[PDB]
Symmetry: D2
Subunit: 261 residues, 4 copies
């Protein structure tokens, strides 16, 4: 669809499953060279790799924990060594777990902040460092959430991590705009991925979530991959520092439908 | 680029010049059927019509003042009568003029509110009324500005009209999301159109505006048309109620570059 | 409570009932001189006047329709003629009525825009014109709503009017900040006033609204008057261009409590 | 000024200097019992303690590093042991240092995130845990910055920490609103404190900062303490989850004055 993506090198963290996997496949379909990332389970990575070969794409899988600095540095260097360059960096790895805020341990809080926010900072830092030192007008796409805007009781660490990601992205976008480096956030609503399989399995829970989505349906991973592909393309040449929400209307305050209140 | 746009009927208000004209040409290139709109004479409309024929597109021009209810109703009906249906409604007509707020006449205030806000409401209302009565999952795209967010001294009427447009769009998006009708805003920054030709003609004024754009350059109309085409396509199927800023970073607070403050 | 408010002249539009009335009484208690405004029913005005005399305050009532330019001009001039000066202008008059957006008449749309937005512009314009011509560091407080942020199906005209008010206020705040003129918005959530008496009368409707308020209760007019008094005082000397929401948490997305979604 | 603050117990982190010190003195003047906090030595704390005695207030100083969990837990317990209860928790400690984002070490990033964000989480958690277990309708005030909204090149860690603080505060506000616990942010612009003494010492730097403030002057600590006192009082009974900016108009986009752009 986007001719300018052909030959571009795209790195995606946490891309052995869910949204990361869907984006890896979409970029492969756009003829971009993809670097998949797995934390520990290499088998899941080989799976995404087979889907990519299925569409005639070219890709490699690199092990790396985004909370380990040397792993992030190595991930970026691996892309350059294998494909000769780096064009798009997508920080997608993340985690979440529910705990009442006043009962949340420092350990749980740090795990989420370290992975969701600091991990994205490291990925962004390494990609931009490369872009700057080589005069490349690359782009960084950070995977956020409707929760960088919508508060989330029981997930205060997650909400804080995404709210922080918003300001990190806007700051990097402003700081490097003069060099032609675009930095944007994608803010997905409820999407059908493994992180929600069990929740969406229960008919009561599923109906509950759907009631919070104005459009009435839980989105598919491909609907988010479509956003990532567009933002990475030259079609979005004048777009930087934004958060593009793809949430079926979640951020519009679903409880106020029908003129309630 | 977007195969799903082929055969879609797109109506664009104030499309005989500037952004409206560029969008008309882009949609024609996507093989959509376009309805161009001019306020009084049709010479400016003939240029766009010729540009559309040049790319093998199909289009018609309809006279209509967006501040006149019957004109807006007729504009929508003309699309249906000529092409048999309506798929995308783009409210783009607008005007602006500088006046110190405490010296602004009610006449100037009303002219801008009537055209920029009420005109968009009328266009949105008529398109949605049609979509609802015919079970069509159409879309409405409203042309806003970075000024639905960035205050604008000397243009208080314009800022108010776009701030109002933001809430109008988000309300319509929430209200009709259950019916599959998407409503979104595009927020352009400084773009090279006739409304800025004189301003950008002066080397001092041009450099002044460029200093307020982090990316360092004034955008081209095609960069905004690219956004409209994507938002109208099924690629943005899960996107509704948002304002997609295409401003080279204007909303990121340009005065804070280099860690100032 | 605020010693600096003693002797200040405060004008409040639509202050014969509800929030306007409560603010009139609160300012009288702060020893400010108040100018009450009624559109037609003078009897309601005399009532507020009696409450003010009850607290030993000084006030006058002036007839005026905020949609009539000469009435707004006269309202401001009356304050100056009676008390010799003007210090605080509060644009509070407003109206709302539910109608599905695609069925809303231009007449209903205009009535709300004219009263809620244009009326506030006129009041703001006249107050600021006076402040500027007399080197007075006055303040303007505009009564908004959580709906300058929260979309409102069935009330698209109201939402647009408040969204417009937000940008109008921020623009005026930026434009006149150098002259020491502060302009701020107050954004009330659901408050117990006559405009909601019937709605809150029904046990089912009342419980429905309360479910949308995190704090669990519908606010009282005095809780909003407290905000107005503080914003008008020198305690808020460095505060301008903001919208202070007093909504029990409505803008925090009530549907997401308990980690839902 | 606020009679309801008499006898209330207020804990303020990092209150031996700057804004924390000013707030400690203001609350003492409101007859509240204050718990001052210093990181290592206590000389700076003794100054505040003497200022508090000067106004006839009652206070104690407690050593504590907000990045050390046991220190935060002890700080809260010390207030309860000394004064018998806790009513207001103010997380004010913070730090910042400039470094180009692509050159920022993980060490610098973590130091700021740990202190500014995680430290505030710990303070909020301990205060709320106490409030919940004792059915106390207490309040938490978190010291943010205009930079939870305005991006800040060279201070990406600071911006991320405050953006994260915004979502943390809004989440806690929503989560505990049903229990009557209010949680709000104060967002100061440029204020005259020791953290800016050197910067504001230079005539060129000072004039540079003032040019980014619409009101034209750098705020004083007392102007921020005024906001904290009001938010803690019952006057703000219906206010929760907001960020009250006290910035002289900084968030209004200063570069757009005079209708530029
Ligand atoms: N699924 C949704 O509805 C939804 C909504 C909003 C935001 N998101 C965000 O989108 C991203 C993708 O989520 P998803 O649904 O595909 O979830 P997912 O769990 O399937 O994908 C996240 C991936 O991150 C990897 N990962 C976690 N910690 C890592 C670490 N330290 N190092 C390396 N890899 C690590 C996981 O192994 C996993 O494959 C996440 O950042 C998530 O917060 C998802
Ligand atoms: N050019 C920019 O930099 C910029 C930035 C932000 C927003 N916008 C918005 O984008 C839209 C397009 O602006 P543009 O630059 O192409 O300006 P433009 O003046 O070239 O286009 C606006 C068109 O609206 C038409 N129009 C005005 N009033 C009308 C009425 N009552 N009925 C019918 N047609 C009417 C005009 O004749 C004109 O062709 C406007 O809404 C504008 O506010 C433009
Ligand atoms: N009550 C709430 O819950 C709530 C929530 C958000 C916002 N508000 C806003 O606060 C303001 C006060 O609302 P309220 O609850 O006291 O309602 P209200 O109806 O009691 O007060 C509004 C007043 O405006 C007057 N008014 C209307 N049109 C006028 C005109 N053209 N000229 C002069 N006066 C006119 C009315 O006569 C009335 O006394 C309104 O702007 C409203 O939109 C109220
Ligand atoms: N001064 C401003 O213009 C301005 C603008 C926006 C925000 N703020 C914020 O307001 C707060 C107050 O800033 P300030 O100007 O008074 O600065 P400051 O440096 O004078 O005060 C911060 C205090 O935090 C203490 N502190 C730092 N790390 C600590 C730790 N780990 N444990 C305990 N105490 C620690 C410091 O010793 C210091 O006394 C900060 O959070 C700052 O980010 C200040």
């Amino acid at each position: 669809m986007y001719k300018d993506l052909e030959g571009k090198v795209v790195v995606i963290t946490g891309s052995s499953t869910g949204l990361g996997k869907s984006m890896a496949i979409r970029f492969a379909t756009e003829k971009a060279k993809v670097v998949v990332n797995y934390r520990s389970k290499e088998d899941e990575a080989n799976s995404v790799l087979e889907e990519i070969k299925k569409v005639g794409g070219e890709a490699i899988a690199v092990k790396g924990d985004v909370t380990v600095e040397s792993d992030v540095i190595n991930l970026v260097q691996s892309a350059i060594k294998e494909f000769g360059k780096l064009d798009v960096m997508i920080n997608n790895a993340g985690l979440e777990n529910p705990v009442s805020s006043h009962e949340m341990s420092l350990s749980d809080w740090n795990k989420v902040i370290d992975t969701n926010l600091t991990g994205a900072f490291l990925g962004s830092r390494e990609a931009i460092k490369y872009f700057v030192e080589n005069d490349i007008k690359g782009t960084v796409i950070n995977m956020s959430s409707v929760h960088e805007k919508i508060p989330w009781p029981l997930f205060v660490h997650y909400a804080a991590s995404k709210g922080g990601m918003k300001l990190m992205t806007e700051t990097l976008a402003l700081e490097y705009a003069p060099k032609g480096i675009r930095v944007n956030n994608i803010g997905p609503g409820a999407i059908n991925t493994p992180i929600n399989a069990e929740k969406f399995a229960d008919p009561e829970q599923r109906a509950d979530v759907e009631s919070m989505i104005p459009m009435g349906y839980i989105g598919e991973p491909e609907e988010i991959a479509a956003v990532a592909a567009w933002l990475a393309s030259s079609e979005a040449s004048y777009v930087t520092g934004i958060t593009l929400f793809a949430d079926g209307g979640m951020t519009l305050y679903p409880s106020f439908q029908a003129g309630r209140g």
